[model samples]
Target: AQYEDGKQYTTLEKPVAGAPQVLEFFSFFCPHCYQFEEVLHISDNVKKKLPEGVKMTKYHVNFMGGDLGKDLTQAWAVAMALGVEDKVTVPLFEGVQKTQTIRSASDIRDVFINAGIKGEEYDAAWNSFVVKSLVAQQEKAAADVQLRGVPAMFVNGKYQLNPQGMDTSNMDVFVQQYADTVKYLSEK
Candidate 1:
C-alpha cells in the first residue's frame, strides 16, 4: 500500500522480494510501547533465525499530544530520511524506554550527528519532500489503523497485534504472543 499522497509506504522503503512484511506501528510516548521494546528486539533476533521470505519493518507513529509529540514525529521523519534508521532505532528506543524521555527534534539531531550522520545531510533530508511526505503518511496510517493505542503491529496490513489480543493481562506475554503470531504467519 502507498501513503495518502500516492507515494509508496514509508516503511517498505526497498523492494519486497516477495517476502511477507511485518510492519510494526509504534509511538515514542507510549508506555506500553516502551514495555514492548525487549520483545521487539527479540523478534528481530528471531527474524535472523527465520527462513527466507519474511522480514520485519518498523513504522513509527507519532502521538500528537504535547510539544514533544510533534518534535518526535519530525525527528522520526528525519531519521528515515538520513537512512540512519538502523543506527538510531535502538538508541531512540533506549532514550524512550530507559529514560522515559521523549527527545525533541534538536535532541534527535544531536543523536544523529553523534551516530556519524553528516550534519548537513541530516538537515537537508529533514526538510526533504520524502520525509515530509512520510510524516504526513504516518499520521494518516495511524488513523487508518484505528489506533486505540501504541505498539500495535500489522502483518502485511492484515492483522493487528497488541496486548488486547493476548489472553493474559501481562504485557510481556502479550509481546511474546505477538512474536508467536508472527512466526505462525511466516510459516503460513
Candidate 2:
C-alpha cells in the first residue's frame, strides 16, 4: 500500500525526516481551502486518527503575495511561534471564511486579542526575530517545492496527495483514506 508517485501522489525531491510528517499547504483566503476545512474538520477528524510517529504540520501559502498574503502569513507564523497555532488556526480560518471580518494584519491582531492573547504578548511575538525567521523559512520551503496551489498535502514531505483524482467528496472516507495512506507510507 505504499504511495506511488503519479498514481497515489507525487514524490518530492527532498523529503522531511524524523517520522512521517503530514504537511498541509493552504491559504486563508482560498475559498477551496475554506470549504475543505469545513468538510475535513482536520483537527477533530484527521489529527485524532494520526498513527503514532506521524505528525501533522501546516504551511500558510503566500501565493497571493500582497498585504493580504503577507499579513496572514506573518499572523500564522507568529501564532506558531507563540505556541498558539492550536488556539488561533480555527478562529483565523473562520474569521476569514465565515465572518469575513479580517482584511489586514491589524484585523488578524484583533482576532488574537479576542482569543485571549495579551496585546503585549502578541506584539512581542509578531515582531520577534524568531517569527521573522520562521516566516522566511516557510516562504523558502514553499518555493523549494514549487507549490502551485493551495490545499496541497504532503506525506512524509515526499508524497503529494491530491483529492482531484480521489473520492474526496465523502469527508469520513477522505479522512480515512488520507490517514491510511500516511500510515502505510510511514511504515515503509
Candidate 3:
C-alpha cells in the first residue's frame, strides 16, 4: 500500500518513526510560507479539517534563518508547547515579512510579549528541556526528510505531499483539494 511517486505525494525512504502524524516543515522568512499562513491559511485549514484524532505537527526549519534560525525554531517550539501559536506564528511572520521590524531574537520576544505572553513565561519556555528537545528534533526531522524547501507537508511520517502538480487556478478550489489530499494521506 504505497502512494505513487511524484504526483500528489512521494514515499519517504526513511520514514520518521512515530504515531500516524501530519508534519509541516516551514520557515517564517519564506514568502511562500507567509502566503500559506495568510492566504491559503493551510495550517489552520488542514488542522480543522483533519480526521478526528489525527495529529498535525509543524516544524520551523532552520536553513533560512542562518545564525538566528535556532532561536526562531525555539520560539515556534515554545508557541506550540504553550499553545500560543495563534498569538506567535503570524505576528512573527508579519514582523519579518510584512513590517520587516523584527531584527533579532529580542524582536521575537517583543512579539511574544505583545501577543500577551509574559516575558518571563516566554523565556522560561525558551530554555525549558522540552522546548530544547523539540528544537533539536525538528532540525533532525528536516534533515531526515531531506527537506529542500519551505512549507512542505508529510503524512504518517512517510508520505511527502507534492504541491508541484496540484491545481493552482483558483484558491478556493485549490485549498479544498489541498486539504482533501491531507485527509487522504492521513487516512491511508
The global Cα lDDT (0 to 1) of model 2 is 0.76
Stretches > 4 Å off in candidate 1: 1-20, 38-46, 49-51, 96-103, 167-176, 186-188
Taking the tens digit of each residue's C-alpha lDDT, what string does model 3 give over 1-188? Answer: 23356777888988878723998988888899999878898878888789998878888988887866667888999998889987778789989889988879999889999989998899999889999898888888887788889989999988988877678888877787678788888888
Cα RMSD, each candidate: 8.2, 2.4, 2.1
Between candidates 2 and 3, name the one with more favorable lDDT.
Answer: 3
Report backbone clashes per prediction: 0, 0, 0
* lDDT of candidate 2 over 1-188, digit per residue (tens): 34555665667776655423777778888887877676576534556667876677888878764778788988989888888887887788888878988877888999899989999999999889999998997787677667889887776666777566455667777767766665565555
Report lDDT per candidate: 0.62, 0.76, 0.84
Q: By TM-score, how accurate is candidate 3? A: 0.92
Best lDDT goes to which candidate?
Answer: 3
**Residue 82 local lDDT, model 2:** 85
RMSD of 1: 8.2
- Give per-model TM-scores: 0.73, 0.87, 0.92
